[model samples]
Target: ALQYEQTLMYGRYTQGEDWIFLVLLGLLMALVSWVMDYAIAACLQAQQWMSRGLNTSILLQYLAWVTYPVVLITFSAGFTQILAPQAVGSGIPEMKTILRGVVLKEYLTLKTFIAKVIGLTCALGSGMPLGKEGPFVHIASMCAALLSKFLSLFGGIYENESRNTEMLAAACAVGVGCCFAAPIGGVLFSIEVTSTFFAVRNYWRGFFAATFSAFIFRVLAVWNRTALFKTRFRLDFPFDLQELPAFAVIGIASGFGGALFVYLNRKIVQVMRKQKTINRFLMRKRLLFPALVTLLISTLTFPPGFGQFMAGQLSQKETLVTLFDNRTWVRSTSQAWNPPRANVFLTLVIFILMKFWMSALATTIPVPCGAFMPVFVIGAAFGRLVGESMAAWFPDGIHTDSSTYRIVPGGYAVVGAAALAGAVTHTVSTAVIVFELTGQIAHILPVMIAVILANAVAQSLQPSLYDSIIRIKKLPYLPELGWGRHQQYRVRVEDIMVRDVPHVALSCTFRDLRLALHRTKGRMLALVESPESMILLGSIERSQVVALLGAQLSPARWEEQQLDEPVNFSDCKIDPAPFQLVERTSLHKTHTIFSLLGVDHAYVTSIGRLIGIVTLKELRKAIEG
Candidate 1:
């Protein structure tokens, strides 16, 4: 049915519709994102105001802080469940699944967009270790989806599956671009994370939409003098040759950090799902679960409680800025300096440990939030620790033949942020994002080197954060053929194809044609040249053949037509270039074709002979076997 419509509607393209739609999509997304940012900032301010009001007593302070986040989290989760349960989590996994051809009902509806917008505001306002980057991607995609739905009225232009998918792909870039105001990185990030086989035609669309969205997002915030994360690292050569090894160590650390984070996050999700009482609570009291999580996280992060050691006073953006400060945080001229810089190192270490578990636990909560910024901040903190250590060790500056270069820990922080974020997300786009954020090219080599090393380590250790979530959610996805899976390469596609599947001959008598149609049982039937030769021709839909027969079987027509006449398959209107693969094709090639092309079934043939047929289900079963 779909392919028939596709063939019929193949000539429906109207010039310049896409350009107008993309511009409108970019504008609407930026507006929504800006509004969300304002609302979130207002909520944060209100929370801080309430906390300040209760600061007369330490216990009151703790109570207010804990209650604030708990209330926000509870409301966010409750609203999500009531309005659109699909609004929960980062939505990147669902976007990926949809782009890969899965039909996820209500996942990108207006209800989800509303719920996600409000829920994400609350989640971020509560000062939970959540970022808006991933959720913004979800929102941008939603914006495109909803906009296209409106555009559906202007003829069937936006109704095309490929065109809508192209819009969503561009929306992904807009989401990331608006969040960080980095159009280039956002486009790359979207391609890396959401698409397995990105179309070259969609490339300029993503860049175009992202550029406009990012531009508008920043323009709206210009009055506030704001950015996602501002940096002041103005150095031509941020790192010395001597510090190259140190940067490499940061990458290794980030790789381990990212791997550990993914492992723990999956473990936490698994335990939550499997443990009887917890799972029961999760199902029965979804709202209560997020509230309880918020209570625990808020308590742990309370300044008067365990939060002081973790720099709990700073927001997520502040945490990034502080970590990336150019000055050495631990170097104090006076022995009795105010605030004491000596303990800052320990504080950063404690922050990493706390956030590692905190962020992992936060993922289990049913709220609309992004996981990237929290991990990015943590990576920066880790780098800061390493940077500060180097600075302390070499306070005077490294001596290199009349050139005295002081160690700049901020550069390390930047490198660390990129490496860790790249490792966690399993994408190199983070390095570009970091460069865009800092507006610096001086440390490009170090950042590149660090991200490469970190990704190498992290990819070897575990699947990416989004991939893990995809598994936990049980979304339909093709598993990657990892390194050393030699058995897959050796296996041939012919081993899996069904040799006895029903098929029709190109020139068959009416009796054989009817029998072949009946044998298929509503499944697709392939056409062969002849029973004796068994040469492959093409496949046709059963319904089309059925319809053809239905018209010819009329009493008047039946009396005129011969029942035993040999029917020409070409006259029956068969698909000429049906999807097919050679019998000798390897399992690896089969998997690639199925995944990249997003096909349900393909015919298997030997030279020109119809050997058999294979399907996605059998391919999956074969892989499992």
Candidate 2:
């Protein structure tokens, strides 16, 4: 019964106060994140109204088509010039820098937060073209980290300062999960984007924490009637091999387009930096101009009967379905086929261009906005466009049916989103996030391909976004030290012993040893009287004794050639140094010691009793294993 109780205490099912604390923390964080999202969304809507106007006819007819893009570009550029340049571009790079400890979390100040929120909302809402989801993640994480700090200020109860990073990462995961209704994606983003390495230690906590936060957010979203995308699709496999090629094409296009979007955004920054005269006027008119333009464009672009562009409405799925439903072939000059009027293709181009400018402005303007939603939308649109075009060009081969096309677009979108994210953050979590979002096994291959390509392209064009940002800020870089570098080796003394040999007493004659050395061909003899309490004494090699005895040796003269008193093990004891002890040491310290020592062997002791020994051979084996 005692054993059973002990086992239960240590078991996975054990209930504890920590679990309760974690649950409460998850709930609180989720609520806070949701409120942050809601507030930002509302602010964005208000700005859109002010810029585009409240009157439906004017907003739909004039502002939507004309003012939106203009306002977005002007606002974004102006804001970046005036306030915080770090807030510009996608927030993922900033988040990555925080996670890597390259930049201090304190950099995510309240001022930057407010600015980012205002800028992102203006850019995304006005349809200047940008993703809100990524930006939201940055906002949520910053809020959570700030909140954690606030809690710490009241009382030093927050044990881990680094917890802020973890909390922010988890918040990002939840934000993505709630936005897309994909819990797994949120979890994956935390692990893939924030954490450099994925293993058991990081996976479970991140997964469960994200899952809990997402669940709460979803519940709140559903209750408030603010769910983003309503997806309905048949869960059937593509009917033919033609669909595979279409998916591949979609993957490639999304990767290239995503890369192009990133490049253009960088170019905008460069151009803005050079334009000194426009800076001052633009800064003063930041909010006003963008707000007006967004309202105007939104009004004109949306048809009169069409509903307002609610958050989370126009996803990749809808675009692809629309394209597949309206596929047609037009012959090129060389009789090559092309998609004529696929809604997906058109929407893709329109949204990509719009989002590109929006993101550029949002980033350039230096506002408190997020890129999460904007990036997701861009990837989705790009994917759908490519998928539809490929299907039209190769109708017989590609699956252009509603369901297949819908799936294909989303797959490509996810891949592009992840790839772009990875390129900026240089993290595996981004790819994993997309996997979790769609919950479709079929998209994995395409996602992997797209992410790899996108990362390659982005890296070739620029340094990692996070690294570049850190460098720009003159912050330090934190390198990843793998777990294998920290682990210690443990081998019993018996395990590495050279056993099975002859034994000699302290009284063994030098003459007898000299004759024995020639006959047995032994260099040294173990001077142990008994195996138990195996006390080691000083060793004497045959060569040393031979030098002492000279060339005179006979059985009768053995007394004259007696061996010198054997050195006592206790007299010349050489103990393992304190620096050589690795047991109970942190992995980081252990690695540092090993690297500094430049030695292969280390003795392991507990309570001053030698228990085992470690060698470079064993350490390497442990690391590899």
Candidate 3:
């Protein structure tokens, strides 16, 4: 039976059957690909359906028109509270957390996956002030994580767990690529946001994967099967020298816009948070009241049917052009005066208010979602509004043409997007991602300028959103400097994990178990079959033993039922739920394993069996040596 069990568990892989493992690995990879495809497609389809249905709803429309701003505000509040509590304002600081690996795997859960889809769909469909690309990446990455976990369980490949995380990063890349139709951007996003260091080993896989996914997306888009946005503008030759100054201007505008976004976002969150005792009743009333007020104001400002709520309704390329060129002239003269485009200005004001409200809601709500899209939309709109107003006032200086107006506004929008992303996420990947999105060499300088300024400003004011939240929650984070740094010497588990441990046997009876439990006075007891065949027989907690023993039972019957069949090591299988084990067989793999698994504890083994336990504590101690 032991031999049969071993054969079933280890299978042909134990005999160095490389082909069998390879084939299985390939199939699993294909499964991951298919799952990601389906998840993304499903999300898109869902968004489309919601958009159509909500857009045509008469009663809902009337209510929405009356309550759109209120709903937007409420949603914003709810959005911030539930989904991105840490990212209560603009999400750049939160993104920084992901980049730093401090918030590793927190958003990679089933709940987050579903919530993102629901929240983003609502935001996009309802025409709330938001973007879809960022949310899509976040949701897709989270979905990838869920898929990875499921695959690990079914495939019986523990390594797939880490691969699952990598798959999430890859999915993020794909989502970004598809959103912008820029494959390189997707790849850069994975590298910038997901990984700490950019080495050949870490980057190539993500790059290739993103490239492939982006290619597929582009092909599908060309075929008109599905796409977020489609464009015909293509330039094959290098940019002219004339474009450099224009690009520089874009950067400068974006830098200031980004700074403004960070300031406003931070201030909004701070103010809203100070209001204690926000319940559903107050939340609903707050949403209804502001929405009605905004709708009334909007009605007076614009003709009927002019109410477009979110960035989804706008053309990104056109908006970009307006920001850079069209607004420049206006910016130069009327730095103080607002624009006369009442409808656009009204929408912009509503968006800004919603942005603030959303941050507050996200913190105060029950659901946890992401803030990527909200920040992007808010930043873009804010930048455009400012640019337009500036260009309108100083037309001679700022507006060379409509194209110039477009460029100035667009440039600022892009910068705002990047800076907010960086400040909220606290990641350099924010810059890389924006660079990829525009896919124009000219935009790089401004993108960098904006992101750096935004990040610096945010950091100066507060710890990144993720760090603050994590600190508030009292979750452990690696000391800031310890990240991606090399120690002069090797670290071992013995230096960290708890040792002098007591262990139990699969064959041990309840009587014997009770004796061991009493003797150990420990919370958890490890179970083993034998030293050579040291398969872990699960852990028996003192609480569990107590619960079991507390029930009235006949010892003879209990022995017959519970202690029967050589203690059934199968039942004692240490599933560990969120925890997993790794071999202490190779010191070189330990760091990789820990980082990939995102865990502090590992059951060490050799020759297809458990040997000892190593924990993050032990690993850290070893590193100090």
Candidate 4:
């Protein structure tokens, strides 16, 4: 039998064959990521090519820019709606839910898989303010699930729910690895985002899988001679000690910004769900809403119009480059798109403001997109603004007796990117991601400080972005324990258990079993020795009990035996050791059991008698309270 045995050991036996699955999963995900990147690049280039050709007239240019994204976004939204609605959104929340043992039907199927890949490609390629990390995670998880389905030899892993979840978790790491080429960080990020009670044994699989995927992805990037967002940074002291204060300021600001962003995102999604008119439009005209949003964004960002003020001509990758450039934007030579007359401060300010609202709204669109990269870019822009201001004020670097080091706005940009992204996602993995991206450790201290500060502030202010989405979607999820320290510890399972659990006697009449089964309504039932003693016997599933009664109560037996004749349940398919707890078990322990063991119900026993039961529904209610 495929069982999820829990044991604490330094290491265990390896099949050696499982490594092939990991390698295959990594190879396939890397190839898929490369293909998606290539498609997005091609599509964006085509749009750029068209825009240049239509530059003869201002009206023509505006129409060309606006209509292209509109068409792309419209198709993306429509494709997702028609084919796989589950493919929409960041997908991180769903992955988190899945990892926590909630099964969403058709979520990991090929239809949703293809829709996610194509929808994400078109959505990002349309120049909308979105990221690919979240969708890529979704895609990778789907690939893992599908691979298990196709290869019957590995069906044992798939058939075991817990093992399949481990596979998905590894795939999640691969998604992040391929996105940023940060293998270790990807594993940590996956664990942080997707797990509530992760197994230590699974860590090696995550690292091994993510390493391969990131390697393959970077190799493909090398072959293509196109670094995604790699930037050059000085190896020596990147920033002065005095700038730690400034980096802390960035962290504080990012914290507030992250909180506000999450707040606004949740509100926008809530408003859409609550407002009857918006809900109707969202449901009835799923195709038009994203197109309209894209039109508004494009019109506002049209290069000749407001684009100059916001440096809107830059694509996602170009925007990162501009922000991370070591040179001061104010003194740098103007490019074809970035006019010399444009104010750097004003541009950064507007870019942050516009993107703030645009990203919040963009998430509501019925298309595949991520919120990370936009938040990352916004944070980078914020940092650059601060760094440039410092540069302007100090002229020279923050001086010291031994040396004078010029401020590197790029370093600040890196810090800000990690801090803000970490703040919003409520994870510190972005700091490592930035480190991996730049290949420099000089600014590690400041980056870590900022990320920690940002996370502290953001977590205190609001739930992480994915948690908010989980609530909005009404998915079954267990949130972090946020109650008062002492109060939660004082609570016990006896306070929450439902005493009127549907149960059957171990030796009961056919009529009694039928009554218990009916009362259960096709759910699990606990078995007791007798109605008088109520001593817990065991637990049995509805279907198994139903089958036994159907098979044993034949026509001859029915005619020969009295209805009051007791039917022994000793031979029934009962779980001998169903999840159970004593009356005195603490709330924290109960929660831990539910979370770690992935148990649906726990029977409360007093001595040897069944007293009450706590279902997941009741547990959630208690936790929320």
Which candidate should be chosen as best, given lDDT against the real structure?
Answer: 4
lDDT of 1 by residue, 1-625 (tens): 1110000000011118878888898999888877887898899889878977754788778778888888888888778778876677777887887776656656777888889888898888889888778888888888887887888723444333454466688888888888877889888988898876778878888888877777676676675574356667656555678888998999998999899999998887666555776566555654666677788888887765677666787777667766766677666211111124337667877888989899888876678888888888888888888888998988877665544568888888889989999999999999888888887778888999999999989887898998887766656656555544467777788788888878877677778878888776745787777788888777778778887676667555125555567765556667654567887888888877877766667877767777778886778778766
Query: Model 3 Cα displacement at 130 (Å)?
Result: 3.7
User: Local error of candidate 3 at 498, Å?
Assistant: 9.8
Q: Candidate 4: how large is its RMSD?
A: 6.6
Model 1 misplacement above 4 A: 1-15, 153-161, 223-227, 234-236, 332-342, 400-403, 481-577, 586-592, 608-625
Clashes of each: 0, 52, 69, 0
lDDT of 4 by residue, 287-394 (tens): 666677888889998877878787778888788877777676544222622566766777777888998999888876767888888999889888888888888877
Cα misplacement distance, residue 6 of candidate 4 (Å): 38
Inter-residue clash pairs, candidate 4: none
Q: Sort every candidate by TM-score, greatest first.
A: 4, 1, 2, 3
Q: Which wins on lDDT, candidate 2 or candidate 4?
A: 4
What TM-score quantifies how close candidate 2 is to the native fold? 0.55
Q: Report model 3's TM-score to 2 decimal places.
A: 0.52
Error of 1 at 448 (Å): 0.3
lDDT of 3 by residue, 159-231 (tens): 4444444444555565555544456655575455444444564355555655555555555546745223221
Question: Scored by CA lDDT, what does every candidate get?
Answer: 0.77, 0.48, 0.47, 0.78
Candidate 3 lDDT at 445 equals 65
lDDT at 485, model 2: 30
Off by over 4 Å in 4: 1-15, 157-159, 218-227, 330-342, 400-403, 482-487, 498-500, 507-523, 540-577, 621-625
Give stretches of model 2 more than 4 Å off.
1-21, 36-60, 63-92, 100-125, 133-135, 142-180, 195-202, 221-236, 242-245, 280-358, 394-432, 471-474, 477-625
**Who wins the TM-score comparison?**
4
User: In candidate 2, what residue range of length 10 has the lowest lDDT sum?
Assistant: 1-10
